Amino acid sequence: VSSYIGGEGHNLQEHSVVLIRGGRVKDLPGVRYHTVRGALDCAGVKDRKQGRSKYGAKKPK
Amino acid sequence: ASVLTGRVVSDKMDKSITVLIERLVRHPLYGKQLRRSTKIKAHDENNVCQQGDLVRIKETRPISKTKAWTLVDVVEKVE
Amino acid sequence: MVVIRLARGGAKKRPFYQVVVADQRRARDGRYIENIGFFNPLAKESEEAVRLNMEAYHAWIAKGAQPSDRVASLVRAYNKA
Amino acid sequence: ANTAQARKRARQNTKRRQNSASQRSMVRTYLKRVDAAIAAKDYDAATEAYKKAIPVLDRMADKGIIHKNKAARRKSRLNKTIKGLQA
Amino acid sequence: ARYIGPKLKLSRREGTDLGLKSGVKPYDVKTKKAARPPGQHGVSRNKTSEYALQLREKQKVKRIYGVLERQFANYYKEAARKRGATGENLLAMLESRLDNVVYRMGFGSTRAEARQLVSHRTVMVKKAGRDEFVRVNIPSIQLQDGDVIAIQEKSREQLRIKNAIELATQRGIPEWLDVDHSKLQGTFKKAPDRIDLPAEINESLIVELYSK
RNA sequence: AAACUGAAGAGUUUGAUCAUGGCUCAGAUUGAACGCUGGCGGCAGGCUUAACACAUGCAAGUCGAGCGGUAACAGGAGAAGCUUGCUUCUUGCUGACGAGCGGCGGACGGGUGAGUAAUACUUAGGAAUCUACCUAGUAGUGGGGGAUAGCUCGGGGAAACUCGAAUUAAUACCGCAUACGACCUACGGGAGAAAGGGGGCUCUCGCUAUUAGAUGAGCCUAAGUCGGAUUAGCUAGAUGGUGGGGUAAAGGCCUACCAUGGCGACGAUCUGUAGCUGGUCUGAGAGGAUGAUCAGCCACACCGGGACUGAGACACGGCCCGGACUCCUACGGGAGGCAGCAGUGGGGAAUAUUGGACAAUGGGGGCAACCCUGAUCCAGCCAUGCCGCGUGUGUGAAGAAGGCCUUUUGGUUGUAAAGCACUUUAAGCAGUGAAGAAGACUCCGUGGUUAAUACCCACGGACGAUGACAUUAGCUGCAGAAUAAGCACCGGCUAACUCUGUGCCAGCAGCCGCGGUAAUACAGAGGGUGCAAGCGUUAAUCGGAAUUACUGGGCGUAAAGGGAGCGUAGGUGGCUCGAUAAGUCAGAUGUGAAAUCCCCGGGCUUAACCUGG
RNA sequence: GUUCACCACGGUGUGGUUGAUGACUGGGGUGAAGUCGUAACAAGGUAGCCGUAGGGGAACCUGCGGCUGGAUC
Numbered sequence A: 001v002s003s004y005i006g007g008e009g010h011n012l013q014e015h016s017v018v019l020i021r022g023g024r025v026k027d028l029p030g031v032r033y034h035t036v037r038g039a040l041d042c043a044g045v046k047d048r049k050q051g052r053s054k055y056g057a058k059k060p061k
Numbered sequence B: 001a002s003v004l005t006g007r008v009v010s011d012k013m014d015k016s017i018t019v020l021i022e023r024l025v026r027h028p029l030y031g032k033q034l035r036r037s038t039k040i041k042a043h044d045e046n047n048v049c050q051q052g053d054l055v056r057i058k059e060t061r062p063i064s065k066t067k068a069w070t071l072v073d074v075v076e077k078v079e
Numbered sequence C: 001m002v003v004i005r006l007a008r009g010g011a012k013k014r015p016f017y018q019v020v021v022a023d024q025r026r027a028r029d030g031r032y033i034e035n036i037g038f039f040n041p042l043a044k045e046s047e048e049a050v051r052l053n054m055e056a057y058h059a060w061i062a063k064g065a066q067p068s069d070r071v072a073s074l075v076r077a078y079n080k081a
Numbered sequence D: 001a002n003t004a005q006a007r008k009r010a011r012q013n014t015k016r017r018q019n020s021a022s023q024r025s026m027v028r029t030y031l032k033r034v035d036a037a038i039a040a041k042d043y044d045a046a047t048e049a050y051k052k053a054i055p056v057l058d059r060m061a062d063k064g065i066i067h068k069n070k071a072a073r074r075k076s077r078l079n080k081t082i083k084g085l086q087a
Numbered sequence E: 001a002r003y004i005g006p007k008l009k010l011s012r013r014e015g016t017d018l019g020l021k022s023g024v025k026p027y028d029v030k031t032k033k034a035a036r037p038p039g040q041h042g043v044s045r046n047k048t049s050e051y052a053l054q055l056r057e058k059q060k061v062k063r064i065y066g067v068l069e070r071q072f073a074n075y076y077k078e079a080a081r082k083r084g085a086t087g088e089n090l091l092a093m094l095e096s097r098l099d100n101v102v103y104r105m106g107f108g109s110t111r112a113e114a115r116q117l118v119s120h121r122t123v124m125v126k127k128a129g130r131d132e133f134v135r136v137n138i139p140s141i142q143l144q145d146g147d148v149i150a151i152q153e154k155s156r157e158q159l160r161i162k163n164a165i166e167l168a169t170q171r172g173i174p175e176w177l178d179v180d181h182s183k184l185q186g187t188f189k190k191a192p193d194r195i196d197l198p199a200e201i202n203e204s205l206i207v208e209l210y211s212k
Numbered sequence F: 001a002a003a004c005u006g007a008a009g010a011g012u013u014u015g016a017u018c019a020u021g022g023c024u025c026a027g028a029u030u031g032a033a034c035g036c037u038g039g040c041g042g043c044a045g046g047c048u049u050a051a052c053a054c055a056u057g058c059a060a061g062u063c064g065a066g067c068g069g070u071a072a073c074a075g076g077a078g079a080a081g082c083u084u085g086c087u088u089c090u091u092g093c094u095g096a097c098g099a100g101c102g103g104c105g106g107a108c109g110g111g112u113g114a115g116u117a118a119u120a121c122u123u124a125g126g127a128a129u130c131u132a133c134c135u136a137g138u139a140g141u142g143g144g145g146g147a148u149a150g151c152u153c154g155g156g157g158a159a160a161c162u163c164g165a166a167u168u169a170a171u172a173c174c175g176c177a178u179a180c181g182a183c184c185u186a187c188g189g190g191a192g193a194a195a196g197g198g199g200g201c202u203c204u205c206g207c208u209a210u211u212a213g214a215u216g217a218g219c220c221u222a223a224g225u226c227g228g229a230u231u232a233g234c235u236a237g238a239u240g241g242u243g244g245g246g247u248a249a250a251g252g253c254c255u256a257c258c259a260u261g262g263c264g265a266c267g268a269u270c271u272g273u274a275g276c277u278g279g280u281c282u283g284a285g286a287g288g289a290u291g292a293u294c295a296g297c298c299a300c301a302c303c304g305g306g307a308c309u310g311a312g313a314c315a316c317g318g319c320c321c322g323g324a325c326u327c328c329u330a331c332g333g334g335a336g337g338c339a340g341c342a343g344u345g346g347g348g349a350a351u352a353u354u355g356g357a358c359a360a361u362g363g364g365g366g367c368a369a370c371c372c373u374g375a376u377c378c379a380g381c382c383a384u385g386c387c388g389c390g391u392g393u394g395u396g397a398a399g400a401a402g403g404c405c406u407u408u409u410g411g412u413u414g415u416a417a418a419g420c421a422c423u424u425u426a427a428g429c430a431g432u433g434a435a436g437a438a439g440a441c442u443c444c445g446u447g448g449u450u451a452a453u454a455c456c457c458a459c460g461g462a463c464g465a466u467g468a469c470a471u472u473a474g475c476u477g478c479a480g481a482a483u484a485a486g487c488a489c490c491g492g493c494u495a496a497c498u499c500u501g502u503g504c505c506a507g508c509a510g511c512c513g514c515g516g517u518a519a520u521a522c523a524g525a526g527g528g529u530g531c532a533a534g535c536g537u538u539a540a541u542c543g544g545a546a547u548u549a550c551u552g553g554g555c556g557u558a559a560a561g562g563g564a565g566c567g568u569a570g571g572u573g574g575c576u577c578g579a580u581a582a583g584u585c586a587g588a589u590g591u592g593a594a595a596u597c598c599c600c601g602g603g604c605u606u607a608a609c610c611u612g613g
Numbered sequence G: 001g002u003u004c005a006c007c008a009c010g011g012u013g014u015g016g017u018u019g020a021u022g023a024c025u026g027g028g029g030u031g032a033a034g035u036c037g038u039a040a041c042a043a044g045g046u047a048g049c050c051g052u053a054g055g056g057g058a059a060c061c062u063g064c065g066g067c068u069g070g071a072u073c
Helices: C054-063 C069-078 D004-039 D043-051 D054-063 D068-083 E008-014 E027-031 E050-065 E069-079 E086-095 E098-105 E111-119 E159-171 E203-209
Strands: A003-005 A019-022 A033-036 B003-013 B016-026 B033-043 B054-064 B067-076 C002-008 C017-023 C034-039 C050-052 E123-126 E147-151 E177-180 E185-188
Touching: B003 B033, B003 B067, B016 B054, B016 B067, B033 B054, C002 C054, C002 C069, C034 C054, C050 C069, D004 D043, D004 D054, D004 D068, D043 D068, D054 D068, E008 E027, E008 E050, E050 E069, E050 E086, E050 E203, E069 E086, E086 E098, E086 E203, E098 E111, E098 E123, E098 E147, E098 E177, E098 E185, E111 E159
Parallel strands: A003 A033, B033 B067
Antiparallel strands: A019 A033, B003 B016, B003 B054, B016 B033, B054 B067, C002 C017, C017 C034, C034 C050, E123 E147, E147 E185, E177 E185
């Protein structure tokens, strides 16, 4: 299936192992799943501060 | 002990009859009483009663493969 | 044979037994024939500690049941008071 | 077998099964004479075969080779067939 | 877990005095606020809704008694299963909490300090009928008819308690509590009635909020 | 007295409207996973996928008071090399005890849910059976024989093991003698047992035949129990009968003959899927979904098949044959089965220790001592859940600084902080310290027994042997605010708003939608809101949905009357007087397991939890 | 021991059912300021629609019967 990478900027390329959750994108025809960002090989978002858990970003020190 | 009454729908087996027992089962959701009927083979030793008769039968030890009831009374007979 | 034995309930480190008439081959907390009372190992000085239906206990003794060494002593020290 | 006791039970089972199968064969052998004498409608041969099979039948039934119920049923059902053979 | 942050913020958001501070000085001068809720904007346009009136009413009681949502919903679930009015029962069981009882009896200046006293094993409870006290570090203990409360033998010389009685005297002592300052010993003779509790808390809004 | 209490809507079709109608949301729940974060405790729960393959250890033994015995160990008596206190060799003499014969156990307990749509399960009954150990009886336990394992002797084999000759004991085995019952009977009569051990002639543990209980098991009947008709006909041992066989027992269970029957639109047959129940979640209810943990029932034990022994098995850690796979081999042959408890590899989004003890409750063996028990009781790990507690408490304004907004001077963060005054829950340290234990053994007394003051049994006292958990729970001190806050969200639904950056890009999004140069919707900040050691997201079920409407909807035009009729099964059906009592209603009895749900209580410091009625 | 009977494995043949694929081909949907027209909505400029048949690049046209869910009368 085709899935949506959320957040600004990612590191995914061919032969990348991702974790996939449910959830359809409304304006994208055919996409019905989301990529969990920060789970296995998809990194978290770099400079995220507000909704960090939804994008796999560690709490900044 | 466990007696059951019904009409004879078949008598074409040696020392054997088929009795049609009717009952009223109530629908668990709609509460209307459907009339249902089971065919029960009984043992009629002397081979007397004919189809269309009312007969009483009681449960006993099995006589054959599909026969474990026995005739005890022919309450009504064909007109 | 048939035994009158305790069946453990309660909680962790707070045992509460029910004295029960069971076929000996069944699991301690599994199938039994009759429950004839209870035993609170940890009970207060103002609470019912041991209760045992002596009528059915005698009936089961005369009927064939064999009490355990715990229920025998429980009845022994319960009928002396 | 994975324990000494299970191994002992197996080698005991072979011995007991040999000993019981010999007596099972004996019971069958003594009932064959009665059935063969019944087959050729011979009241005297069937009676003299039956009389010498009852002790064997009831002795193996008491040993446990056959059930007492089987021994009794065989006795009754061979007596009922011999007596009806011109008692 | 309990709330640790500022309390006048809570009072300003509820628009009423929750008794979170001591009565040593009037609530108006303690904060020069309560005319506006906290934050940059405070008094707002776009008026509230039925759900806002219900949420604020439930938060009011929760912040008054210092009980979080999980325990408070267990309270409501018990109250709607006991006989009678659900809101009356919920107020009775919030008033029968040990920390609230010691606050009303006056051994603590605020319910937070009363809970702090209860938690630190400085209050002994004697159950009705029982001929013994027992030190209890659990603020959520429900007291029945006749339960006795006393102060620990090694904490009767507390300064905070001695200045908490004199505030309790200036504030008023409930009639369902029989407190003696001579040996710091009260008795919970009966859970308070709805007529004894203030007639400004609409428990009907809490009951309608816990109905989807 | 109580179990009798419970029901919310919103957004979105239009220029607007009312209706219809779908979609979406707010709730509850979980054996959850993931992301961010993370202090503690109590109680629960923890491979939902591969019934995939399994390294290693453990999960079933016990009895010498059945027997020959002596491999080991320890004693004892003598031989004493005596090496004078070194010390060895004979003996089963004793405590005991490997292997062996024999008994009982291994059919329990534990695991799994593959198969199974009905030899299943649930409810209610039934008759034609068997049942070790247990209880209460009854009649006995007499007298012989031939063997044989170990132990010998000689081989074969790499091993696994094995062959031959000789040969000993028994509660092993087989005759013979008797037989209250019991079995067969033509009812005149016929046949059929056993075994001894132990303690001082007795008692006791056994054995034999059997009766009655109880327990368990097998068997049968009726009712109920998923989807598909784009599956309508299915059956030839099939349906019934007799003679015979078979089984513990009814029965086409089997067989020879006789008859042509049996089942099906009340769904047979065939197909798909599935362990079933108590219950669990949801719901106002009715319903819907589901069948983890606990309990009952069933089925299975690498796969296919057969049976033996036994009271009980077609036997999870038994046997035989076949098979796939894995391993050992000297190539000839062998061995094995974690869906027991830990654990491994693998699969997966995902699920723990190769721990302790039999102290308790049970289970197996034993006369006991005692031995065994991965059942069980505990401990370990995991925020997986529920419940509880904490991360301080008061007081503190020219309302400090800093941040943010701003009209550039105010507002807000905010009594918030600092300062001052106290407190020490939990954690940390040090002490103390219940209860889980049932009082074994031994002594004394009493009663029963007896020929007996013995022995044995029962009862009554004294005695303190027995604790894995465990450095227990709890309780008392010490120190110091010290060791402890995060997550989501803030356009509406929906509680909470402003700046800055961006500029239909980057991005958000459940829905309506937002983003085009002044974005309360994106990203960051300040502020706020809700929850809180958790918070969100995803998956899944019910709710809202009266959106399959039984409760409780519709069909002129919104989806929806068959083109019309006749008619089969079926459904429904006038008046009056009777009978019956099936439906219906009431009463009684039996049952509807316990747990759970609910009510009233009781015990944990509270609660969860446990528990009586 | 032998032999027969029952029977598991395994084998042979011939069908049924169903999963994945398959050159090519049929229609359905989505996507931009594309091409051709303008069939419908007003009497939509030939009233429309229903069944059916024939025809046509395409909406469609025509015949036969039916309907009003047809304006102007």
